[PDB]
Design a binder for this molecule. Structure first.
Ligand SMILES: *[C@@H]1O[C@H](CO)[C@@H](O[C@@H]2O[C@H](CO)[C@@H](O)[C@H](O[C@@H]3O[C@H](CO)[C@@H](O)[C@H](O[C@H]4O[C@H](CO)[C@@H](O)[C@H](O)[C@@H]4O)[C@@H]3O)[C@H]2NC(C)=O)[C@H](O)[C@H]1NC(C)=O
Ligand SMILES: *[C@@H]1O[C@H](CO)[C@@H](O[C@@H]2O[C@H](CO)[C@@H](O)[C@H](O[C@@H]3O[C@H](CO)[C@@H](O)[C@H](O[C@H]4O[C@H](CO)[C@@H](O)[C@H](O)[C@@H]4O)[C@@H]3O)[C@H]2NC(C)=O)[C@H](O)[C@H]1NC(C)=O
Ligand SMILES: *[C@@H]1O[C@H](CO)[C@@H](O)[C@H](O)[C@H]1NC(C)=O
Ligand SMILES: *[C@@H]1O[C@H](CO)[C@@H](O)[C@H](O)[C@H]1NC(C)=O
Ligand SMILES: *[C@@H]1O[C@H](CO)[C@@H](O)[C@H](O)[C@H]1NC(C)=O
Ligand SMILES: *[C@@H]1O[C@H](CO)[C@@H](O)[C@H](O)[C@H]1NC(C)=O
Lengths: 47, 593, 593, 47
């Protein structure tokens, strides 16, 4: 979705995506990480 | 005190699937009234329910409703949007692109109690099905500063909604019903109301600190506070400790001195914060001062010349927009012993990143962090290379204050590592937050540590669970060294004990300080081994020495000078009136004058 | 800025005759609007006029109208009585015993603008002819605290006055006419007015800091201020230098930081005051701190252990009710170098007083005041014994700040003495007030002193007039020593010059520092004589030495050690690695190793 | 006027007097002194 200039932007095997209705970039984290670019560990629930 | 929650920081980040993000949003905002972080309603698909969002009454950040094809979002009790951090550096209420592939997205948004956004503006974009919101006059809700920063966009080529009820001023309503009408607070005021009011009569002027509205003329009748709060009233400034005297030109002690903490004026600052001379609860003082020794609370005093080069942590100061300790900022952590912020260790430093084109972080380079002794923020260790098996960088860390916290609950996170032991042998005080050590592979190492002795604030817990086996690791040398005290032990080394059983030579747990044998001549005080002066004779029958000074030797080694035991007699030491003292020995080695 | 005056402090003291007190009252209160002291109308007999009292609009103390048989006292513009110092420790408006021998005293008192006394109550006693004042409801004028401290007394067995006009509420009027009616400010308010209002309508609520009344809803529409003033507005607290941040938990710099000075919030403190960290202009800091070195302004920093024993002056602190330096308080001025107040010298200390039964003050005992070096208040020397002819106690006084002043105009008064000379040889700075030296007998001694170099504040004058002859004293050795510089001289001694002509040996004005003759070996720098090291040889052909060190001798006296000139060679001085250095002389007296 | 217990209360040859309508004591200064008990020198006007 998002072009090749943003490789490695979404950490912890999260996939990068491009929202074209807002002209913005977004991440998709795995279960256990939150944040803008999958950088915050989910400490409150499930380790 | 209202129910508080820290919220999320997900701008547009979906969490796994749609159901996983929906469950995370459900678990984040259940029974919350004051959102100290950000209200972020993203990725809520059709046939869902959002009844848990009805209790939110205060958001301290930006409200971001984006990509939501659900029919109704009941934000019915949202009375104030403070907006401490903006969205797109200009907005605090952004509803953005709520439509599916069939152009049927968000339909109703009944923000019945939204009356004023303090800091921020309104950004609506690409909302075809969102009706009964464009008729709201946004002059009441936006502040007097941001009339030009606002931007509106609507699409009314649907024809599926209805109009307002003819019992409300200027035809303004949020949804279906007479209860969904906008309560006008500013534009219907008279000339004499300086801020906002209730009705068109001139006898309804509210207080200045009443942000949304007032239930009466007094400052105790405000619904929500504008800046500060004296616990039933809303205030501009907290009452300081010293009030000025216009008569005697002095500074008298105020009996009602309240310390400013956040949006509140508390009676006293907490333990891990800093009391200033102005009467405030701060995290850091000025550049010309330093936090000095605690006399019960933490003050600040001036330094000589320039002060110490204080390292700004991750997320505050010059490193505010940063996210991890990387190859650039690690040169700034050279010779500082007090971290005024966070120390985040992420896999982005060790794996590499082409978005900034930086080289990856080196494991030997983390020895620049050997001199770290104090963390005011929270510690987040998340990545570690497979070479070293011990956290050798934080070997001198003593007190973790935890003035900022991850999720407002945790202050020490050591997760997902290939380490063997922890090695935190100098950690003596954790004043805030919970400590979680989980998601690891080769680290059991926790059943002896009494965390209540390290917790400086009551009401804290831990989640050290699901590490390794819980019955199979403990038979392969997992139990630490046998000279550790049962108060706790960090690693299997004899020096990694929390305290010792009998004596502690420096850091090593020994049974005795070499009484009647051994090469060094040591004694016992404060359960520690301390060497004496080397002119004590080694006695194999009785004890050797008691104190550190040369007067405490029982028998001198070579020479004796009164009570002192000395190697050589004084033969030219500086005396009085140009008299260098000549001293000669005796048959009992007494240095006679 | 309104016209200010300090007023009088005469409680019941008549000044000479009735005409002399009337002329003093006339000269004190002409063209005054803000009375910072006390309004004291006493001893005004019949057939007089008091039209100069119409311009007074603010009294910062107690109003005391006593023993006045005049018919009319027009206090028509008195809008506020602050009352910083009470009368009988309870009152601030006392009208007391206005009647002659024929029981015809004060008749009319038209206080048309008196609406609220802030601190104080009303005491009326024994006023037979005072009509049209007892009909005034005093609930509006007294505060909400002093409803029980008030006491009223009237005598209505005269029948010479008339009633009020039937166009005013509740029949309240101060005198004859419809313009003399009481403007009710509090008792006609509604429920929503927190303080005071204008009319019976609920839409007339004034601001809290509007003391008397308001001309509108804003805080800039107050007539007079309650506590503080932002220069067109009336405020509770001045805006400080640092405002608290509820977001980042910090203390941000306020661009609108105003320093609190009295009832005003000025932009910066003046020269002789103290700037605090809270943003105030004070006279003295706390007991745990001291006023440190001026960096343009005066700050305060903490001391180690206990601070210096600061001597409280006459009229402030523990010596507030005192009036002179007497035989009791002089033991408290033992070892202090900074006087935080006044040093009054009165004839009551040297003549004796049986009201307290104290022994009189001794002239040798004033040597306890030898260590006085700084006066923050004003100096009032008024008495001196006929033995000593010079002010030898103030020989080390350096800077007179003048933070409080006698009559608000004068800070250094040396009057009515039997001294010969002044002897103020160390007075370097007078930061406030005028300097008057008059009423003396044997003291001309003033025509050379340039007072503008000592005045630290512009707009000051002096009244050194009518001392002795002005042409006959100047031919009998009145002119000071001929080596004084023409900048000024205090006494006829060679050391009492302000500055010297050529050089100054310590304090003595010399032409040169013993070049080519003289017993001490001295050089010239900063127009001063400085001795050298005694191992410089005395040369009678050329100069002797240049600098203070032993390297600056041209020829050594006895021994030479490189560039140094020394008495003895080093024969056992401490060196390095247990080597006491033996040095032997040469034929040219060079101490060789 | 005032009794013998208040001798020397009024300085600089000022005479003591008793106000019986207020039960109080007062001083009478010479021209050149003000104050409660004739202790303040008149510095603003006439030396
Ligand atoms: C490793 O740590 C590095 C520590 O410096 C880190 O570098 C930081 O990366 C951030 C990524 O978002 C930057 O925000 C941050 O500072 C930026 O520097 C720019 C220089 O021109 C500024 O222009 C920028 O200002 C604005 O830019 C963003 C762009 O999206 C705006 O959204 C934002 O509102 C902001 O105002 C900003 O100041 C940068 N730090 C420094 C000192 O440059 C690096 O990213 C880390 N990660 C790696 C290497 O993977
Ligand atoms: C020489 O200097 C002396 C400095 O101590 C000075 O002594 C002071 O004289 C003042 C004259 O009025 C006193 O006010 C002052 O303190 C008083 O001490 C009294 C002891 O009992 C207190 O009772 C008294 O309290 C109240 O008394 C007066 C009585 O009229 C009230 O009017 C007043 O409101 C007050 O509240 C007050 O505290 C006194 N200082 C000390 C330490 O005793 C002395 O008078 C000077 N002159 C001489 C010797 O001629
Ligand atoms: C929120 O938590 C409460 C626990 O008190 C629970 O009863 C409720 O069902 C939760 N909300 C939702 C939407 O599940
Ligand atoms: C938005 O408001 C800010 C004031 O906070 C100011 O920069 C300007 O008015 C607006 N900014 C832009 C970029 O339009
Ligand atoms: C007050 O002073 C002015 C001088 O400006 C003078 O004209 C006036 O007569 C004085 N008042 C009285 C009552 O003499
Ligand atoms: C007068 O008021 C004061 C408060 O300032 C208090 O002492 C009391 O209420 C009254 N005093 C007397 C003596 O009645």
């Amino acid at each position: 979705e998002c072009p090749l200039s943003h490789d490695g932007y979404c950490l912890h095997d999260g996939v990068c995506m491009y929202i074209e209705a807002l002209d913005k970039y977004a991440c998709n984290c795995v279960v256990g990480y939150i944040g803008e670019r999958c950088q915050y560990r989910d400490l409150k629930w499930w380790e | 005190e209202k129910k508080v929650c820290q919220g999320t920081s997900n701008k547009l980040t979906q969490l796994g699937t749609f159901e996983d993000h929906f469950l995370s949003l459900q678990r984040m905002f259940n029974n919350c009234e004051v959102v100290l972080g950000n209200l972020e309603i993203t990725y809520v698909q059709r046939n869902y329910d959002l009844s848990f969002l009805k209790t939110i009454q205060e958001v301290a950040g930006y409200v971001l409703i984006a990509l939501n094809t659900v029919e109704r979002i009941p934000l019915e009790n949202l009375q104030i949007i403070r907006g401490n951090m903006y969205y797109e550096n200009s907005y605090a209420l952004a509803v953005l692109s709520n439509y599916d592939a069939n152009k049927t997205g968000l339909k109703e948004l009944p923000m019945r109690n939204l009356q004023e956004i303090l800091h921020g503006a309104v950004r609506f974009s690409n909302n075809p099905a969102l009706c009964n919101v464009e008729s709201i006059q946004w002059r009441d809700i936006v502040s007097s500063d941001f009339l030009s920063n606002m931007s509106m966009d609507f699409q009314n080529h649907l024809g599926s909604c209805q109009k307002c009820d003819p019992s409300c001023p200027n035809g303004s309503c949020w949804g279906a019903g007479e209860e969904n009408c906008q309560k006008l607070t500013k534009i219907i005021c008279a000339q004499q109301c300086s801020g906002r009011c209730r009705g068109k009569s001139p006898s309804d002027c509210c207080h200045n600190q009443c942000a949304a509205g007032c239930t009466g003329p007094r400052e105790s009748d405000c619904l929500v506070c504008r800046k500060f709060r004296d616990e039933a009233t809303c205030k501009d400034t907290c009452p300081p400790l010293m009030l000025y005297n216009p008569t005697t030109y002095q500074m008298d002690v105020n009996p009602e001195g309240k310390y400013s903490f956040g949006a509140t004026c508390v009676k006293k600052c907490p333990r891990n914060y800093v009391v200033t001379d102005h009467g405030s609860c701060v995290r850091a003082c000025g550049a010309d001062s330093y936090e000095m020794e605690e006399d019960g609370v933490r003050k600040c005093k001036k330094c000589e010349g320039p002060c110490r080069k204080v390292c700004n942590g991750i997320g505050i100061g010059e490193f505010k927009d940063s996210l991890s300790i990387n190859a650039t900022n690690i040169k700034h952590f050279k010779n500082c012993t007090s971290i005024s912020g966070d120390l985040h260790i992420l896999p982005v430093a060790f794996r590499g990143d082409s978005f900034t084109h930086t080289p990856p972080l080196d494991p030997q380079e983390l020895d620049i962090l050997k001199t770290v002794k104090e963390i005011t923020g929270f510690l987040l260790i998340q990545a570690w290379p497979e070479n070293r098996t011990d956290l050798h960088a934080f070997e001198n860390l003593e007190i973790i204050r935890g003035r900022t916290k991850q999720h407002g609950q945790f202050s020490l996170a050591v997760v997902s590592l290939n380490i063997t032991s922890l090695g935190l042998r100098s950690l003596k005080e954790i004043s805030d937050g919970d400590v979680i050590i989980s998601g690891n592979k080769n680290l059991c190492y926790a059943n002896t540590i009494n965390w209540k002795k390290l917790f400086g604030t009551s009401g804290q817990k831990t989640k050290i669970i699901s590490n390794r086996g819980e019955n199979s690791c403990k038979a392969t040398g997992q139990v630490c060294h046998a000279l550790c005290s049962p108060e706790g032990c960090w690693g299997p080394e004899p020096r990694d004990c929390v305290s010792c059983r009998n004596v502690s030579r420096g850091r090593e747990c020994v049974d005795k300080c070499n009484l009647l044998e051994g090469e060094p001549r040591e004694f016992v005080e404060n359960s520690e081994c301390i060497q004496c002066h080397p002119e004590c004779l080694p006695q194999a029958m009785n004890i050797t020495c008691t104190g550190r000074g040369p007067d405490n030797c029982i028998q001198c080694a070579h020479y004796i000078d009164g009570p002192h035991c000395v190697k050589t007699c004084p033969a030219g030491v500086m005396g009085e009136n140009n008299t260098l003292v000549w001293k000669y020995a005796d048959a009992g080695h007494v240095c006679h004058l």
